[PDB]
Amino acid sequence: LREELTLESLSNVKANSYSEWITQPNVSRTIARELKSFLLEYTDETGRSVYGARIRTLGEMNSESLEVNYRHLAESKAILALFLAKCPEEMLKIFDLVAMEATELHYPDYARIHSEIHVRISDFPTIYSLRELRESNLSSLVRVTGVVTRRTGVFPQLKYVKTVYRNYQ
Amino acid sequence: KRRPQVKLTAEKLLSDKGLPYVLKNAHKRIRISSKKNSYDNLSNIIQFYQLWAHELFPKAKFKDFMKICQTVGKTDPVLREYRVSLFRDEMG
Amino acid sequence: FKSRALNHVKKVDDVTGEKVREAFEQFLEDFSVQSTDTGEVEKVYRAQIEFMKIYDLNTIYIDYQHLSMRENGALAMAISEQYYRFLPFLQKGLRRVVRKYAPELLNTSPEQTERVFQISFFNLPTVHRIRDIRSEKIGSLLSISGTVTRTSEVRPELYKASFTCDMCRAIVDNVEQSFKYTEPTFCPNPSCENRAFWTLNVTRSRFLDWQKVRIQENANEIPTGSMPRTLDVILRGDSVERAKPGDRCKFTGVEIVVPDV
Amino acid sequence: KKFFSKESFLADFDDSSDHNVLLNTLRKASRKQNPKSSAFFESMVEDIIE
Amino acid sequence: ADFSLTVLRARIALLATAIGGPDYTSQIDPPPYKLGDDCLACLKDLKRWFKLVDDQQKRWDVAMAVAEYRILTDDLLPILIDWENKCSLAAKLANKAYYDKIALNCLQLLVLMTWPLIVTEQSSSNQITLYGELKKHQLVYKKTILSMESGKVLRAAIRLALDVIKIDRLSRTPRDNMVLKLVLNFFRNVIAIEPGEFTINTKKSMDTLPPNVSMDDISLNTVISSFHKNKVFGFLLTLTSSLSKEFDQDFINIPLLEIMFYFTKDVNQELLFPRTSAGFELSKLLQKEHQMRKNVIKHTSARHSRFGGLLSIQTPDKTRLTVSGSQALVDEKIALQKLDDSKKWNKRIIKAAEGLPNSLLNSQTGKAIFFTESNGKHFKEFINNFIDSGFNILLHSVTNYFTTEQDRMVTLEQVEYLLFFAWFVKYQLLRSKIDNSADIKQVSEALKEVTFILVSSLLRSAYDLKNWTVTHAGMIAFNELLNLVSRTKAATDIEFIVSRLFSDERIQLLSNLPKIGSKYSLQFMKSCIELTHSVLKVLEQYSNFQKVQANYMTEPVIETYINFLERFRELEDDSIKKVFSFFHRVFVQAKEQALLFRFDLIILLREMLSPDGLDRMSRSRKYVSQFSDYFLARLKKRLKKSPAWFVGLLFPPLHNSEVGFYQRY
DNA sequence: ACACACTCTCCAATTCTCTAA
Ligand SMILES: [Zn+2]
Known about the structure:
The structure is cut from a larger assembly and holds chains A (169 residues), B (92 residues), C (261 residues), D (50 residues) and E (665 residues).
Chain A: H1 19-22, H2 25-39, H3 50-60, E1 65-69, H4 70-75, H5 78-86, H6 88-106, E2 118-122, E3 155-158, E4 165-168
Parallel strand pairs in A: 1-2
Antiparallel strand pairs in A: 3-4
Helix pairs in contact in A: 2-6, 5-6
Chain B: H1 10-14, H2 19-29, H3 38-56, H4 62-75, H5 77-91
Chain D: H1 6-15, H2 19-32, H3 38-49
The complex binds zinc ion.
The site of zinc ion has 8 residues of chain C, from loops.
Chain B binds one DNA strand of 21 nucleotides through loops.
Protein name (chain C): DNA replication licensing factor MCM6
Family (chain C): Belongs to the MCM family.
Subunit structure (chain C): Component of the MCM2-7 complex. The complex forms a toroidal hexameric ring with the proposed subunit order MCM2-MCM6-MCM4-MCM7-MCM3-MCM5; loaded onto DNA, forms a head-head double hexamer. Interacts with MCM10.
């Protein structure tokens, strides 16, 4: 509960699978602290912290999506990049809940503008066409290219199963 | 009430339809021969008893007929009276 | 509580399967063909296992002529005429040998699941036509040739399943599927009786690659006044997307019978 | 008849005689790898200054 | 509460990390583990969590916590193995006490976690809940312990023993002797863990190996290999053989009995003697498969399943029946069988042993366990050296223990003793049957009077209290004593032992035994039959006999014999020879013909003699046909002399005084 | 409303046990 792990302690996956290791409370709190420490601290060679500048422009446009480059996350705290590649569906939940703290540090009461922020990953370093996908790729993050053949109209969709909705296509 | 169950009983055996038919006919029914195999003659003995058992009480499998007969044969006093009567007839 | 053990559980066992298993074991150990250039025993299949260890492969190829000359041909006959019965026993036989000589291959960091080996055969005595498939040959080992006309996209097939109960925290594992999607019969925890609301754990369950292809008879073989028949063929594992439409191919495997699901 | 004595056993006990690339990359990097956050707050404070 | 439970689990995890960890400066990819501090307190507090909390509350929750955090696989084995390898290298060259202390306190936890599991109606609901899952985890423990560096942790345990072998018994403190008990108590648990038994609550009438475990990990064959490479068999052999010389017998000999029980249990002795070979017998088995296929074909119609017409069969008295199918048109036997087969009812049926892992007592032992060539010869070498070296001294000590302690016994120790006796006596008899190099003097301690009295007393007391499992096991042991006596008489005191073995009281007991067997499982009746055969044969070669044989012949024994015989499809070739030996004795020699004139025997001879059942060329058919010919001859004579027996054949014989005597003769 | 699938309930058939002649 109270105690936290070191980053070196996370080098050894101790449970029988990745997802059952990320979801534990102490491990999750350690990952949240390390991601917040990464987001507040990464720099260009000129100093000039890029993500502080991006959070600044997030409110200037009243936007909803923060963008994170994968190469930056791999350049330091590499194990988090590995976990993200293996278990995106959990890692992005934790990352979004950190990103909201980072944005509220700039703009208090930004929750009144938007209630939730999504992290967008960029420059994932491996690519497939639609040939190479196999069953081993299931639940893993992938990067794909092609031509969009057909598009539906936009609809609302029930978010939770008092009610809330989201767009869908 | 639900309909009561139907069972084999000593009254059926002691009926004219029952056991007296076997003693009236078994001397004429079965016939062994040295001229046929042990398996052949052994298969011959069970024909008459199987058909008789079906004619008496078609409920159950043949083994079940025998093993049901064991209980009432050992327990009922009237049936035992009939059997000692048979062996007294031979003592006569 | 009225706890009770399954005292009567002791199973029936097929002796032929075990003897075939531990004879195929010996064949893998000591086929002992001599070298291509010299009179020196080479033991090619152990070398092939070592090759697979070097390159992390998952399939092994066997020559039917090599099996034909082994032990007066009885083992080859048993494998040929009753492939569907004896295929699990061959897998069990190969697993022990790979454990003996290359335990690194048994696994596919956290724990690593087991490798699903594949046995393959080639150089069978004769090739049949699509027109020669007859129901007397169901379950046997065969080889077939024809022209490809269609292919399906690769899809994941559920191989072994694992479920968890909604009304209580209990887990069922290693459920077997065959032709239709199949789910447990009871809640294993006796404190709960709910049969409904299972969910398939995608992480713990295991899948396989699966592809459908369609073939027709060779044009030069069609008899007088007749027209070509067609057939559907299943490909799995490392052989998916190997076939191409319009090409001529030769297949081998076993013919099966599929229900109306 | 055998005996298998103690002293023999004590004496004899001792004397007897592609993600494949990326995984290695990230593992090695992981093994190899308030004033520090001041740049972030500076970017925040520049809105006050400019 | 749940939060208190998870608080204890988190405490156990923080203790599972304070223990220490490997070194990240090392540049050695990976290094071994590296040691923490407060670790004495950590191990001690973990021991307290087992003993002072879990045992006092009867939970197994603490074991679930340590299994969750994988303490055994992760920390204890590398700690012990690092200690072993460090001291090993130091021995190659040829505060250190603190290292030795940590070794001891790691081994004790290893013994505790792998301790075998017992469930009763007095176990807590918590333990009953947790039984099925801890079984899985203990299977994982067995695999992991046998796997690491090809099982090197087992060398540490015997080095701990070697420290206490070292100096004279006259010096050895009680705490010193507890080590020598502990090291064997470890091996008993490592052998004893095996695949689970499924258990459910009988509320409604409607595999457990985890994903990381397989059979070849868990089989006894693996245990033989692992033990041989890690130098265990020498340790057991040298410890048991010199047991007589002032090793304090009290601390060692019962655990050392339990080991020998725990890997004799699932071996048939014929598998260890042979009596391209595999392929040859496989081909022969395929011929047998072809015969079964032929049997199915002979009942298969030529034309398809919807071609079939209809048949009508008319009885005497002109009543008619109806049956379908094409084969019924030609085969009246098949038509008669098929007619009765449609009828729905079957009479529901009555059912003896519980509380003991699987053994000969409650499993069909016509199913071997399978060995590598090296494992086969190594195991043969081990038990052969055991018999030639250790058997008599071990049995003398353990038997002169139990005579002074019989009243205090528990069911485990009785069944253990009785199935150790039997296995080794039988194996020596077979080995000396095979070859002259072996001799029977190696097992001769069994015959001396005290052990005979003790086996007799166990059988007596078990029979009186109606404890049927110990009765079964005592039956098996007493069978082997009689067989060994019949061996030695075929070569002084042995006749005295026979005369005391066959006092009238024992004849009453041994005559009583087959009668109750009718109700029980198949193995019980088979044990009764084989014991009866041996008993009667020994008293045949005593020259009393007519008194004894008339004691055996009556209705309930014949009932047991027929009830056993009708399951012939599951039985061996030999047991049927024994049964028909007994029937020859009853029918021809004793001339008590009236017992067998009962109808359910006449069905059995049809089933067993038909083309359905016993093979056309098996040796059984000689005996069966040669018996049935004479049987029907005498039956013909009896039936024509007195026609009343037609009605007699259905029922039991009639016990009235005045008619019964002429009935029986 | 008309065949089906599935659940629930009660009652008597059966075997087991104890006692005395
Ligand atoms: Zn449930």
